[PDB]
Amino acid sequence: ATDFNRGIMKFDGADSPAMIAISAVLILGFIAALIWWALHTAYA
Amino acid sequence: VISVKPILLAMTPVFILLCLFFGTRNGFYDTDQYHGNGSAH
Amino acid sequence: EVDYNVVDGVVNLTGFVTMVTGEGLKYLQNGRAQFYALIVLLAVLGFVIFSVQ
Amino acid sequence: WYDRKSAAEAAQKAFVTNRVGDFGLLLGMVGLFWATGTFDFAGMGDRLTELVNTG
Amino acid sequence: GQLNAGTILPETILIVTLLVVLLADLIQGRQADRWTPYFAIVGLGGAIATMIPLWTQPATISFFGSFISDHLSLFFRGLIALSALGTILMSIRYVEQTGSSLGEFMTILLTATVGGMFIAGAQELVFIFVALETLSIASYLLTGYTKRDSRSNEAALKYLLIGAASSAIFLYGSSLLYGLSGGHTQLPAIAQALSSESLGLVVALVFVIAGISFKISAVPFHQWTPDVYEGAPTPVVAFLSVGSKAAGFALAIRFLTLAFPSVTDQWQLIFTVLAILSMILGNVVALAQTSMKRMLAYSSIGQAGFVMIGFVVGTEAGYASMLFYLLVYLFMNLGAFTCVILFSLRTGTDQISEYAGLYQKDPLLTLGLSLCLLSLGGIPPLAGFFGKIYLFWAGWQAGAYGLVLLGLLTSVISIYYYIRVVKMMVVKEPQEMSEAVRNYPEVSWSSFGLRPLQVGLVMTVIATSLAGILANPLFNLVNTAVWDVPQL
Amino acid sequence: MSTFPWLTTIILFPIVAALAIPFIPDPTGKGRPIRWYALAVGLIDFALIVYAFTNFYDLNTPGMQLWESYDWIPEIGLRWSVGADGLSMPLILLTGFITTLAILAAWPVTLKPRLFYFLMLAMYGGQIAVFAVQDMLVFFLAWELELIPVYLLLAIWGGHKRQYAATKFILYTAGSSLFILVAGLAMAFYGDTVSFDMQTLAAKDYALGFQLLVYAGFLVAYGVKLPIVPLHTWLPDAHGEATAPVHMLLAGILLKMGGYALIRMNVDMLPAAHAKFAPVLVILGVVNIIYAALTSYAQRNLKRKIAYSSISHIGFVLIGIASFTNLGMSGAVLQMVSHGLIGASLFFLVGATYDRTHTLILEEMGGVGQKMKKIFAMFTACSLASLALPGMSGFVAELMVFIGFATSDAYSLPFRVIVVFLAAVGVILTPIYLLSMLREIFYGPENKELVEHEALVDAEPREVFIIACLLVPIIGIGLYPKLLTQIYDATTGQVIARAREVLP
Ligand SMILES: CCCCCCCCCCCCCCCC(=O)OC[C@H](CO[C@@H]1O[C@H](CS(=O)(=O)O)[C@@H](O)[C@H](O)[C@H]1O)OC(=O)CCCCCCCCCCCCCCC
């Protein structure tokens, strides 16, 4: 986590558990939304 | 449409002979400039 | 951060909760022979009870 | 002149900023082969008219 | 019936070999230890060589309803004799190095071998008991043979406790089978005299299953195995993990298919529970063992669960998968214990951490223990991959999906603690090697018994690597030993 | 020859030759006769591969060619059934080519050279065994054949977090080949035959519900091997801590099995479940592309950045599999060959610049391109090949995947719109990371804190030869794609016509 916070990717509070949790639910919820949408919108 | 087989059959002995030649053409790892053993640690 | 924490947390947690059940399942074998024969006789009783309904 | 830093950032910015348009050139190219199906300027000039005048 | 004493000629040759080894060490003493290991090897080879004319015979029930000389008992007799042959090839330098006598050791070991080989075909309840306690008492005496060690004395005491309790439970089951069938002691007569499940037949079944699963080391009866394999001499625990377990499985196939072909769903549910929880607790507690002998004990419990997968299916291919896995498990486990012997003879240690950096010192030992432990893990070109392939092929055939899935999952778990030992021997740096490998002796196969050690190691490694791809004669040899099992 | 056992020789000759590795005399200890023997065995096996291809492989036959079927164990249906299809022969040729180049690129190793070249030849015979065999149990055997070789190539050579990487790799890949064996046993015990041959298992008629379960098991087993982003985290550890030849044949070939077998036993075997799961595969390929491009951008390590780029470039393979057109499948096979070449060139160059600069962090290694000019030139060329640049083989496969997916009338119109919109933001995202790392690693003024400690020597002629041998088929296929497509356009034309019989 500290090895990712160096140089260009350097943001305060990026490896915090609250930010990791909200980014996790955002990313993986868009994954699950895209998968459910593909199973529903696309036919075959 | 041209075939891949004469191209491949004409390029593979060149590939084999140039592999056997360019094995003998190294000049960094066999010298003292390289401080290692091939492993990346 | 999501990739290194959450998905690798599921992977390392799968590898971790299979390590603490055997660092905590080895205490079932505790060095006492009379406890071992007690486990043998409890097994006899439990297998008779479960083999008849 | 890769020894300069401003030339480096300018070259990367030029490739990525042209690629922001190549995204979209590729999108319209793929979508015009999807709609028309010619990959030809005069082909999707008038087959687009045959399409859009119909339903 | 009619007495057929030509059947017992393997065990007769081995009893005569026992008597010659004992009389030679009484006549000549410790200087009889220079040739009597090779005589015991020739006697075991003669027993296996006399099993070859018996393989081309009918079923020929030998004594007055007391012995079956079919291909299943011949396979198991050859398996127990090969286990003792590898054990004698391992215990020449190890027993002499402890200051103990080798001839008395070899006679107790050959008594355990004739007990197992008499278990392998046995119809009388009393012959089952007498052969089972010949094997049991010889195993208790072999367990605490190094009696100056506190761990061997403790292992022998807590092995005799658990074994005597399991023997008396087995005997209560055998007495209940004698009473329930009227007055019969032969297993087909018991099968004919009772043919329906009842309270009392289930009791005798579970009592006998406890006495058998003591030898199998199934999971509620496994608890003697880590202490015994940590405490006893290492060739003794090699024999206990191969030949004693093969004798227990011979007893299970001989008993549950002959004496109980009526409660087959009940003991199949029992052995399903035994297999499931044996695979689980055998493959996840070996992750935390830091000694090689204790890790091999828990791995042996896991392998017993893998064999019970094929035992619990109840088809011809399931019994064949069990037989083939016991056959290849002989090779891989005798090779692993041969490497444990050869490392403890040169370093005097047993911890897995002390194996670190062995690649440049002893390359043959790392090749041997790597090939045998990866064959135990299920790595493709070796024998245990094909054994597990047959064990899961027969087990997906008769719908046992959960057992095959659990066996594959616990084999994946098994890969970790085998590859930890392979990582210690092969992966670890020269600057990260251990204190036992820094002070490693010169590799010399000429002291007293290190050349039989190297011969047994080379033979078991060539077997456990080459005989996975050459398994079709082994498949043919195994699948004719299954036609002598009732109901197939 | 045509009666000679060709693919059996191709598989078994590197293994049999690797068994003669400890008997090679080597007094100096550095392992030069061993590397020359391994290079000779690799070149001889590649010559036999191309001889069997140019003589006994017919480009207009959709069925199996170079067919051998020997009887291994008749009790369980175990047969040594090998064969060369259109899905197999470009990957067999690519395996021979990349493994010979990786053996040649493996030349700086002096740690344990006998064991190293034994494992590389035991992977050479065993990689082709995955693409070649037509038996499902031998497929599981050859699939698990790379458990211990890649473990020991990971754990002895390369990386500081190499032991955790090798441990996670071997446990993860073993737990997925679990599902390989489960699905093969399930679909071979279906009906009243126990034929384990892959053609006969494709010829069966499985009901839906069984097909969905076997597809779920195969999908777990291949979404581990092919990097699918929920199941991909073995790869950045196992590829960011590997030496350059091991990484070359580790993401040039081993990612392509599992992606070869996504066609062989998920599309060609279970089409009724492929028609149900293909929107999920399309979305997972899109998420592969975008997710792994973003994690390539955020990586400050070099090897993990290129590993994540290798995850990103197989999303187009997934989209081309789950698109039901001939051009989509053809672009998927073209991507699994082109990314093999392009990626192996990138991993070799990353290993070369790490052997020179002794660091992987982009915050170090400043103006490195002033001192290694040939590594800068080759790295820029192969990075441009990764950006789907036309005239090189990375663009043609991606364009064919885009066109073959968007013209696939099996899907709805907003689905195709949203997917080809989202699959095209990787067209932006790949120059972002792959030129920021070029700008940060080679461009700018010279990092004098680095050049004081390390000798920044330029490329050997052998390294320039390896990158030129990788870049000749890349440019030669990107300029004329029918050099490669003509190898597999028949068989894929057999596959899609077999898979379009389920769609409404
Ligand atoms: C998708 C299904 C595919 C698989 C199905 C079957 C599962 C197989 C289970 C096998 C695991 C049991 C072996 C014991 C593990 C162990 O000991 O720990 C070993 C190390 C920890 O020790 C580490 O080990 C290193 C070395 S070592 O031996 O101590 O050498 C050491 O350096 C390090 O410090 C130490 O922490 O942990 C691991 O790396 C285990 C990784 C194995 C992962 C199993 C599959 C996980 C699937 C997750 C899917 C995620 C998707 C969800 C996303 C939203």
Ligand SMILES: CC1=C(/C=C/C(C)=C/C=C/C(C)=C/C=C/C=C(C)/C=C/C=C(C)/C=C/C2=C(C)CCCC2(C)C)C(C)(C)CCC1
């Ligand atoms: C999260 C992430 C992802 C997702 C993604 C998505 C969400 C993306 C989107 C993106 C976006 C959505 C894209 C967009 C694009 C757009 C473009 C890029 C722009 C353009 C503009 C132009 C260029 C201009 C125009 C102009 C105007 C302004 C005015 C008038 C004139 C003109 C027209 C010229 C996933 C899940 C996979 C996973 C990982 C993470």
Ligand SMILES: CC1=C(/C=C/C(C)=C/C=C/C(C)=C/C=C\C=C(C)\C=C\C=C(C)\C=C\C2=C(C)CCCC2(C)C)C(C)(C)CCC1
């Ligand atoms: C093996 C194999 C096979 C085959 C291939 C072949 C067929 C190839 C072709 C080829 C062609 C027939 C060729 C054409 C053309 C060529 C080009 C034209 C080249 C170019 C080169 C350049 C000149 C380069 C340069 C340099 C480099 C070296 C590095 C960097 C820098 C620079 C860029 C400067 C296949 C199919 C399976 C695929 C894969 C592989």
Ligand SMILES: CCCCCCCCCCCCO[C@@H]1O[C@H](CO)[C@@H](O[C@H]2O[C@H](CO)[C@@H](O)[C@H](O)[C@H]2O)[C@H](O)[C@H]1O
């Ligand atoms: C033929 C049918 C039976 C097949 C049996 C399979 C094993 C084949 C024979 C292997 C035994 C001969 O082994 C031979 O001697 C030793 C083993 O001490 C090793 O010899 C080795 O010595 C040292 C390392 O120890 C090296 O520096 C040397 O280059 C190498 O020759 C080799 O392995 C081989 O040279």
